[PDB]
Amino acid sequence: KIMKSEVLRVTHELQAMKDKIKENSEKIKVNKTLPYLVSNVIELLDVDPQRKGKCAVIKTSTRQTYFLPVIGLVDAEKLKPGDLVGVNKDSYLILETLPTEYDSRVKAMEVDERPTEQYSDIGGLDKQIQELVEAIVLPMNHKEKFENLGIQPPKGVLMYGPPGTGKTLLARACAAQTKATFLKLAGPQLVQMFIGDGAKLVRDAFALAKEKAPSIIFIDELDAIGTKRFKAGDREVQRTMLELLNQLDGFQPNTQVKVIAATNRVDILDPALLRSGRLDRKIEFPMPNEEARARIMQIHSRKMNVSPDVNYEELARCTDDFNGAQCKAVCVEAGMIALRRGATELTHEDYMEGILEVQ
Amino acid sequence: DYRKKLLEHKEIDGRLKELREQLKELTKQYEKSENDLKALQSVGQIVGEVLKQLTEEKFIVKATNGPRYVVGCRRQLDKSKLKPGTRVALDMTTLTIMRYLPREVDPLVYNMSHEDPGNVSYSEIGGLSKGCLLYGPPGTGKTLLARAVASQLDCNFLKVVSSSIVDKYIGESARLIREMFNYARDHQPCIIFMDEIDAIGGRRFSEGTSADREIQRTLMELLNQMDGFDTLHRVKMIMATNRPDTLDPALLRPGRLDRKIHIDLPNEQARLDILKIHAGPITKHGEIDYEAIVKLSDGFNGADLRNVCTEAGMFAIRADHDFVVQEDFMKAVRKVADSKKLESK
Amino acid sequence: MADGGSERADGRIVKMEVDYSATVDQRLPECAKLAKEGRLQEVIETLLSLEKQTRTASDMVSTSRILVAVVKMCYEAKEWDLLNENIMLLSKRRSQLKQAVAKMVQQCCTYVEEITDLPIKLRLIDTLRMVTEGKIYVEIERARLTKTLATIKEQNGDVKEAASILQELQVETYGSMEKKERVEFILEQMRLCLAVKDYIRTQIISKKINTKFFQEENTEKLKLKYYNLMIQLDQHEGSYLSICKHYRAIYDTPCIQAESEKWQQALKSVVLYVILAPFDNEQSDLVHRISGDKKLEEIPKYKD
Structure with a gap:
């Protein structure tokens, strides 16, 4: 062990380095x-x-251009054309680079932490919503098994069906189970007065999804802007829309945060929406029948003092070709006039009274 | 007694020599910290532009901020880059010149940087042995192949999106056809991709409106630059689409699209090969049988075959089993593939 | 769909055993509309990979025992695009055309050794005009027919076709990407040049020879032999400078083959290009590329 006795001097030099890095690191x-x-x-x-050649172009907020090479600490997400970088008084060095994304009108579109409703508020849809509950739980917790099996979750899910089905509040109800940051976005928000705004809105959505923590971005009313016209505004929505599809087709690192979409009608179906990253999950959500409407109305009305003598036959007969949010409006309306009816217990005539009231 | 002390002392020497790697690796980064701290000492440089040079040693500079100045020549640099018309850099003290500043488009970096890695994708396309048409029969992969060779070399990344010919204002897109194709004629190597051409591939059967007439007019410029008075022997275009029915039979002349490649899975060896390259990172039970999956699959989509096979892997992960038997592959690829046949209208 | 022509194919090969060429003339209207129909791209590929074997199989039966070959060469020589004139929508296949021409040159290869001297000159004079009339090919068979005819012209004693083979070679070497076949077919440039000895032709063709090729993507084994066969004729046409850049690249030849015979040729010509090197600059630095080799001092000419 006489040859291994020189290691002590090396360890003394290394611990001396750890003792001397406190000042220059301080x-x-x-x-x-x-x-x-x-x-x-x-x-x-x-x-x-x-x-070696390495430089960068700087632009100050006061419209002054200077010269400086690429300097600073170890850079991994840096070297991108961004803003909000660290700089001292006059030497103009780069010390701390942090992405800005400012235009708060699009950044703070819908700042929602988590909703209140959960998946246990509906009844009779587990055979078709269970695939989505899996498709939001297993890609959040089972990332370890994704390497043993080589699985990449899809990023585009098409939640299509007739309107008024509560698909927005149901996808939000599943977003409560996602536990991630919920961020809404409306279809008619892309159509703006100025030119090139849709590029800033899309690159902003992928700026918060790409830059920020794992979140949830649910959009709706996509069919209202998904028109395949053959000037025209929907062709500008083909510039922004096909730009988004180019960001869902040409970006292999898109394995990050998913983009959930919902269309209230499938009349104008864009054929280019078929891809692993694009809207491949096409689970049909038809109009719930009187049984399913009595289920979602029963679980949505399980909090009010409902009379126990409800056979669901009268309301099952009156509810013909209705939707989910319509029966939700019947429940809320019953919770509105049931107060002024004097009787604190919900009666049976209030169902048809609300149905014929709002419809 | 004596023979064991050599192995034991070899073990003490082992655990003594196994602790240096935990420090000597990070000491290089710790010293790199002070190397960077010594690298951040070159500060205080400004920019400028050269318009008129009177003296060969000392010339006039034009700063970005607006005020103009005159500088000298540094003993290190020479008169090669000192010629006018080249943007240079200056210093606050003595107005010396350290180096120059090569111009570039704020957007030219974006148009010349997007790059896609991956060299095995050229050999991961499956059993597949002045223009190319990538039409849309029941089989996908039009993007994995163009992005497979494009990810291999492509000699550039000149991607042409079908949404870049919108021209919200007056339809003068001829400046962009002649501008971008003039860039293709300027740069000796060039490869052009035209994905999703069905949106701009209107058949103009009936009387088209002003929105259709401008796109069909850009198609008239395409005619005038493909079979007009301009050859395209060196440049290559890849017309990708979705439906091989509305592909402008006026443009379907074999003078432009020499060959037709039906992106499908016809051959059993191509479906088996793509099934094996998509079935790489998946683990399975010892019972392996690919001939049932390849045989039962008739005219499907490649990437969607990956989505159906991984969909069967998630159908197998519903029961949280680590091993995945091929029974859920036959029955889940069977049923889910039949659902794709239902949604294949 | 090819399901209609498949029964006519596998049934036609069974029914067409002993019948004469008149039944083929009866098959002409049966196959004309069969080639006009079938707009399907990938489905009719089998119909064109079977019907052509039925008509060429009937050509094999007709050419089996007795052959006049006049009507045979008149059928194809007069009927090339008869089915391609009524169809205005050219399917731009280019998939069975290579099998068509390759099968024709395969049957002509089985009939090219010794059958009858009369029809071979008209068939070859027809197909070399088909080279010009094609204008679209992989440039493999077009060179094959004219080089397998040029090999016969070598012993035939008629060197007038040198302008034909070497004039068509430029067309047969530009417009495609050929790595292996280009080197195997590029020796025809300097093959007949011993009989032609045209200096301007040598100036056109090492110029067109050494355009883009240094070492890679071209293996035979005999590469160094053709290397010796390339610029030796430029030494025949030139005087001394032709070998200055030629004898400087044969240093890897002893590494590829046995070094026993390299003393007589490689280590002999290792000094001639540096002796004939220009006195201005190449003599100063080119003497250091050969200095240091242990095999240099073993030569008795080392003192020279």
């Missing part, structure tokens, strides 16, 4: 304390002919 806090302004960064690779 000045990091006083030199990198606070970047006082914000400057935009534009990446431009240079060539010196070590003597």
